[PDB]
Amino acid sequence: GSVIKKRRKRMSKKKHRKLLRRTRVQRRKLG
Amino acid sequence: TMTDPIADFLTRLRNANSAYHDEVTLPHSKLKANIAEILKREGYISDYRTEDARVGKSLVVQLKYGPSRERSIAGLRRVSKPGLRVYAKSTNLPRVLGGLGVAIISTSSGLLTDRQAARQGVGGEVLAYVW
Amino acid sequence: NYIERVVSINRVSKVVKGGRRFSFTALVIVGDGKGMVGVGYGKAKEVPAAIAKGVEEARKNFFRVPLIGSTITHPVQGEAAAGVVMLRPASPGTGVIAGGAARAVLECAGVHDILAKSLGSDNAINVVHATVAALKLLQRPEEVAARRGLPIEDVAPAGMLKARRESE
Amino acid sequence: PTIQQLVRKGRRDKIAKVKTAALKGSPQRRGVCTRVYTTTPKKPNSALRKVARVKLTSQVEVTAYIPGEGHNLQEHSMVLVRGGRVKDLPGVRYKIIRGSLDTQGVKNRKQARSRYGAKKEK
Amino acid sequence: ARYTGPATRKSRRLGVDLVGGDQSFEKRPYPPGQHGRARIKESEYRQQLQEKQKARFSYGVMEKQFRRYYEEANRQPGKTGDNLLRILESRLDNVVYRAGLARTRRMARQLVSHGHFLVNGVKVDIPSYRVSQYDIIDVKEKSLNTLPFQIARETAGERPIPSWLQVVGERQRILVHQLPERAQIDVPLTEQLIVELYSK
RNA sequence: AUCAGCUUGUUGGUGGGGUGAUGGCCUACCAAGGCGACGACGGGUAGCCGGCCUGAGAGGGUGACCGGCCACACUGGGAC
RNA sequence: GUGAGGGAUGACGGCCUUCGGGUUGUAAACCUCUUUCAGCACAGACGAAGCGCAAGUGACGGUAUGUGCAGAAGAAGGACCGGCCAACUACGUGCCAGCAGCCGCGGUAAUACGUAGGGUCCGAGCGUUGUCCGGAAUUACUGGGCGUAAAGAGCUCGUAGGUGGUUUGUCGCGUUGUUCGUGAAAACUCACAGCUUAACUGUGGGCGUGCGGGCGAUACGGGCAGACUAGAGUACUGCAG
RNA sequence: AGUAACUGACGCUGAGGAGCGAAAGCGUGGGGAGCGAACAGGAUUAGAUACCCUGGUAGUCCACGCCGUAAACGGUGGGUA
RNA sequence: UCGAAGGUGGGAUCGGCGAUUGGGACGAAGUCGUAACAAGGUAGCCGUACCGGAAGGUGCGGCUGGAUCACCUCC
């Protein structure tokens, strides 16, 4: 299997983790 | 573990047939002997006999090949199996190879072929197909 | 008299430093309509030449189909590569019910009434191969009776027997 | 799967995507033109496609395509819209029926007249 | 409805003569129009469709009626091709034409539609009327002296009357012994092509 | 199940009452049961069927006319 | 039903052209024939072995229908023509105007746009939209898969469940045979009959794939009562890590 | 593995469920030589939040617990002939 | 006594709007950089942690779905 699919999935995962890091305190205070 | 002795018998026959063996041995039981009887009487196998084994008895089957080494059996399929079992009435008995094959049916009158069961007006469990 | 069926022309190409070199491939069927068929696959730089090579290849490789009057003896199912074609005999007057590749092969083979369906790999070459493989799985009743060493009436049903009678 | 797995879970068919949800089970709907304008298609093609913004009776705001050569649609014009997709335009699934209600049949049309609401010449 | 346009067009397009003795088809046996000479692409669908058009323009049957006939013929326990052919042949206008009482199928249909005939003692004016065994088709007494029947009754040397029909009276009575079989039909074209087309 | 617990006349008994009729149908007392992953309890949708359409068949969709059963008659209760 | 037969080195016009001519086209014009259906005139029902002890009684309806009269006389449109998928040329326009179910067509010479000739398919219809099934074996019971295409839980133990070696007897639960009752009619299918045919309607079978009762069978599955050791486990003696 | 002394089908799979489960990470208490995210300088570079060099804190180690993920791969579920 | 409707009360559950705010898809030609594919010029990817305008960098463990190994003298 091409590593292209792994690359797409990893970019999605990395962006989501970055978003989670950027809004940790906001999420904690809203929940 | 072993679940279907009948299917194991059929697969021993099929595997020996593909390998052009002249001989196939397996543990003996009444049902397997009756299936061997039907196969021999219908001319699919050469001959069968039952020796005795170390514990019980064995079944020995001679495979029939033509002069140019062409197999006398074209296929062997198990129809009714543990889990999903198949029963047919006397009127909707299956046809094998458009009638060119033989379907073995277990009726209360014993083991019969599809044509015998149709002629006698009986039904039962469809054990296997031979063609 | 021979009936020919050019079932597909394809333009294939190989790459070179200058560019693309296009050739032509033709899949043809050759038969007499009486029970003999053959399949050829020719390639050339020109379509008529490829057709000619396919025709001669199909003529060289012939194969007799076990007809019974106007149809095949018994249902079969043949598979070659990923193509799966199922064949089923039909009552007289039904006609050929098949797709383009199967229809070409069966009409060249002389089969008049048959139900045929393709169940995989719509590619024409492989469907033709699967149809030929299915037609090679048919057995005449005499051969079957010889195999099991039984009279022809014991093995075949009465339905097949008189169908041979009326045809003969 | 196994037969037992089948009797335990069964087979679930794929769900069907509903098309033209704004119609709400009707072959056609009547709307009023929120705005009539023009737009450019996808990249491979190029034109000035004529598109109307229609507010249907099913309370759905929908963008509809105007077939034919010339049209006489302006604001607050009652039209009858149907289903039909235009490949070039991204999110247009409806076309305005020519020759019904305010929208007029095209002019000087002599072939496929019934598809553009142009009467036979006398 | 009915087809009233030129007859030679259909013969030219289908590549065979359907009227039977027309000189225009022999003069130009190719399709009509500007492009009647262009070579055609070969397609099984085209051949099947042209066979069906031949059948339904020889007998003057429209498409819906032809489809009903095909369904009826398939439903019957014979074989589809000759069943369809026999159903087509059993029409009253076709019977009148094959009986030698009409030069062409169109005029046979016109005569039947005008009520010039009378089947089994009761007036029938229905070109699609189907004729059964031991049917007696008679010309009503008023129109026996008309010129069409006059020239029909004094030129009884044309196309032979098939076996399943027999003219017995000097007044040109028609008797139907049994519905025709495929052997005696004597029709152009191929029924198998129509059967193939209608199974698509 | 991105609805796991539900039930207290609720589960059973006895004596009464009630009904054309059996029955927690109602009632007094007594016992603590009853249902649920074989999906109870919730949420959504829906009149059911002979049939109809499609399909080679299995199956899928449907319940217009005609025919049978049910439910309702401005909304909600009630009896005569 | 809007007509039928005959009708030519194949009229005019249109359109294309290689400027020759070809196509519309037997089509037309003309010569005969027939009038279905409409129009006019005349007569005129069955449905009522009915109802009524009164003399009469049909809403439909003066309808259907039948007979005369006149004359081809009053009667054809829609979609499509790049491939799938029957059916191609010219002019106009030029990445526009537009088309399009998909592939995709518009860049001054488009068989894909617009219009005209021609053609094809249907025809009192022809197309468009909406919805369901088919094609789709694309939820695969019939009838699919999981190394790399989507798809084996990270690995075990184990609950409910599913499934189970050889053999004896018995039950007749499943299974199977037959018989009785039921499965309304209508519908469907087969045959016949009646409407001038058909649709439609009636009659008689089949179907109603099931369920309930009796009677028969015991190969297989299951239950019950046993037996065996080839599976499984224990024991003993060694062994490697 | 061998003997086969013993029981006499006691087998297989297993929804849910329970347990185990690299490394990183988290808690409490210890320990800390080397290595070393982060962080500092140096260099390279157009620019170097990198690659290379010099330092270097968590962590890596131990005890007791959490976590429950991996290219946890033979990308190949278990049993049998 | 029961009893519809009505009133009071505290909760369930389904939607709409919401100043502000997060990401997603698409958009010929804008800006910034070169991350991947040839050993892509530091092999790539998986889990995890930290850091950075951004692709990304680095540590620990894992996988190959990673390229090259010339000449090579005795037999």
From TrEMBL, chain A:
A Pfam family annotated for this UniProt entry: COX24_C
Entries under SMART domains matching the protein: DUF1713 (SM01155)
Region ranges (Disordered): 1-31
Protein's UniProt name: Conserved domain protein
NCBIfam families reported in the protein's UniProt record: ribo_bS22 (NF047430)
InterPro entries: Ribosomal_mS38_C (IPR013177)
Source lineage: Bacteria, Bacillati, Actinomycetota, Actinomycetes, Mycobacteriales
Domain Ribosomal protein mS38 C-terminal: 1-31
Coiled-coil intervals: none
